[PDB]
Symmetry: C3
Subunit: 335 residues, 3 copies
């Protein structure tokens, strides 16, 4: 009975980081309490100044990742401040009943609600806004993130051996549908409401104008690159609430991957590219063996390089000539 369990309070952090948590734990079930505040805002999503009339959990695309253990209860307070214009709610794919909690969390600007559900299944799960009659619009405008439900005894390989990560990153991939006017330039809207009609028209073509990681072209590149070092194991959580994607680490692999994102199933090993179904989150582990800059991208290369679905991981450490060596550098072809 959930009423009798101990409560904990978790402080969320902004993507691409994930809040501190244990993997395997000696702890028993708890009611883990979280709070999120919705923020509607205009965001610049590319390097030429295009804006999106966006909608977010906690001010970020994606929303923050929530981490619990299997058998915990998630207790979320969702706040919709009066400065917003639209009603919102939340649908947790990790939850059972009431359209994922959406029917129980309908909040108009100025309102809040608290939902509890039992996280009875391990895996990474999408959560997203789903207001009746406007579901796709709120999702493509930015209202999604991940709930990770870890097995109480941590991650396991196909033979039941322990797996772990030393750091976790969360990447949300967003297919955007920005309208254009008769001059072929992207439209800039004064309000969220004014963007709706034109956006629906672009959506129905099924062709995104942009496909971005974490809300913007280059959000995870250069100074914003993810980091690691040789010998460190990273967990890359990848969510796509609306459209398929195919993650790939250039120069690396998915050592252990749950592409459907559900940890009670055996992972696959040695993947070059994996597949995240629209409406899901998946998870890959990789242990770095070489230093350098890696590209982490959607391997539809047009979607990555032209539309925005690409980031970087900068890795410290010692180069390994056994794994790879330039035997002969570029030089004139012998005559």
């Amino acid at each position: 009975d959930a009423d009798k369990l101990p409560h904990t309070k978790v402080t969320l952090v902004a993507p691409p980081q994930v809040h501190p948590h244990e993997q395997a734990t000696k702890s028993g079930p708890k009611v883990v309490e979280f709070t999120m505040t919705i923020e509607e805002k205009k965001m610049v999503i590319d390097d030429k100044g295009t804006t999106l009339q966006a909608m977010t959990f906690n001010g970020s695309m994606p929303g923050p990742t929530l981490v619990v253990h299997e058998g915990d209860y998630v207790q979320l307070t969702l706040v919709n401040p009066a400065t917003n214009a639209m009603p919102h709610n939340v649908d947790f794919h990790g939850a059972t009943g009431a359209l994922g909690g959406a029917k129980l969390t309908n909040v108009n600007p100025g309102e809040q609600a608290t939902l509890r559900f039992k996280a009875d299944r391990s895996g990474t799960f999408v959560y997203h806004c789903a207001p009746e009659g406007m579901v796709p619009w709120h999702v493509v405008s930015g209202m999604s993130g991940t709930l990770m439900v870890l097995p109480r005894d941590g991650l396991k390989d196909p033979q039941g051996k322990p797996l772990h990560y030393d750091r976790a990153y969360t990447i949300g991939e967003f297919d955007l549908y920005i309208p254009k006017g008769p001059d072929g330039k992207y439209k800039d809207y004064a309000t969220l409401a004014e963007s709706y009609g034109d956006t629906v028209q672009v959506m129905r073509t099924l062709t995104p104008s942009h496909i971005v990681f974490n809300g913007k072209v280059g959000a995870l590149t250069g100074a914003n690159a993810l980091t690691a070092k040789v010998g460190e194991t990273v967990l890359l959580i990848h969510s796509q609430a609306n459209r398929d994607t195919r993650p790939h680490l250039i120069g690396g692999h998915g050592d252990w991957v749950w592409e459907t994102g559900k940890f009670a199933n055996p992972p696959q090993r040695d993947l070059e590219t994996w597949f995240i179904r629209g409406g899901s989150a998946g998870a890959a582990l990789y242990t770095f063996k070489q230093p350098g800059v890696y590209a982490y991208l959607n391997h539809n290369l047009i979607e990555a390089f032209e539309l925005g679905a690409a980031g970087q991981i900068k890795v410290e450490g010692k180069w390994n000539d056994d794994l790879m060596k330039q035997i002969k550098a570029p030089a004139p072809i012998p005559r």
Copy 2:
């Protein structure tokens, strides 16, 4: 030798139901006899009166689901009445040889044929029309369905334990390519033949005008919703003969899913969203734990909510506060 085996005759039923059958059986192999009659007809496929010049097995999209056991022989009589205009045939993905039976079942209006094949592999398999030179047109116009070949000892989990369903539903998802005229309104054609050229042009864009379950927007919503009760296990068979889809039960899960649809492989558990490859049928089991209206949809939410790929399941029973509880209903934010 199939000539010496007992024959049975099966009476088909209209989707979304599936004809009565056993799962695990003490019965030995049989020749199971079915009949289907092709019907070409104009169908209304949305709520604004758009029509499709359609082609069907047995008058429905999808055609009916045929169920046998592994080691049975399927013996189909395919009838193409003289009231039709086009030649047709059938390609069973569950069969071996002769382009799935298509080369042996070419029937002009006024003709019929009978094919037998050994169902030697367990799983859900697409069948579809495939006339030489017009294959995509007959498929996208509605000529597909599912053959389910159950293991003789029923479904099994990854550890070899028994799985079962208490009721089965069949959902065919159809990407449609309806042409428009210069006024931007959908075209209405007097005959099937007259729709061909314009439709091919839309097909080649790869952008469906509509994506529907069971032949129409809302075919499985409201009064037409699927039904179940708390404690009942449902099998959802999902076929897509031409294009990928990603099924999801909102408020629920895929407890056990064969997304590639082949029962000799272990199922995955706890899925939020699964993936049906274009040209295949998959199968998910779920046991209801909460009452209420569930949405069952393609989780490209634009494809679901804008284009039509969404239905409902209405579930009777008792609400379970342990699984989910509204701790605080929507109410003003405390000052």
Copy 3:
């Protein structure tokens, strides 16, 4: 230490064949040496004379398949002749570090380089060109192929039993983005450089003009069909470096399939249709049981029949009435 190992030299062959190699081997690790020469050339890609300003490894789309065993080192000499116009490189998904080798193999026309890497993971892996700032263009213009890294003790089924193939074929599937002029006819460009801008514009629509196997509509049909006989096991290697596809053998199955292409994972059996993620290569085994012409195609049937993604396998041997029989040929419907 790779410096002390024996070297071998492998002579590559043109797709759809694969160079002679052993599956299970008693041999220890070697440094396997290969050479490829890049050729830019204009190619005719359909039956109406459309051209592509193409880029290739070794003159073919796809490039040749390279085969080694797990624990071998691949040592590639990449040659970019002075007759070419563009810089090139190579990214092996089977390799670890330096963006797959791309950072170490940047070759201008008139240059060459030699890369070595350890093939420490079994599976079929894409390799492709990836010059900074032009990655998608070189890939969609034809610069991809497969590296197959076989387990030293050969392929294995889910229970660890031996699997084998008697012949191997390699199929590269290419989504092409050919521009059109104001008359609606495809453009013919005098040089590779002149095709770039217009092609990028088509790419960004995400709609291919053509999707072809092995560089052209019909490249694997008719006189160019693959061949086999009843009782022979074929391995079909299928690569797609940019876009998802869904292979299917009409009249057959994937007996054992590694759709993510990585041999340390158990294969799935009895597939009707499998899924190759954009940016990967997969592998299917099938043992023929019936003679005849089979179609091997992408089962988005519009992509196959309208856009080009279809071939044939012509199979010799004896028809098997137990597997399939025409009980009654097409004939008038009884009155």
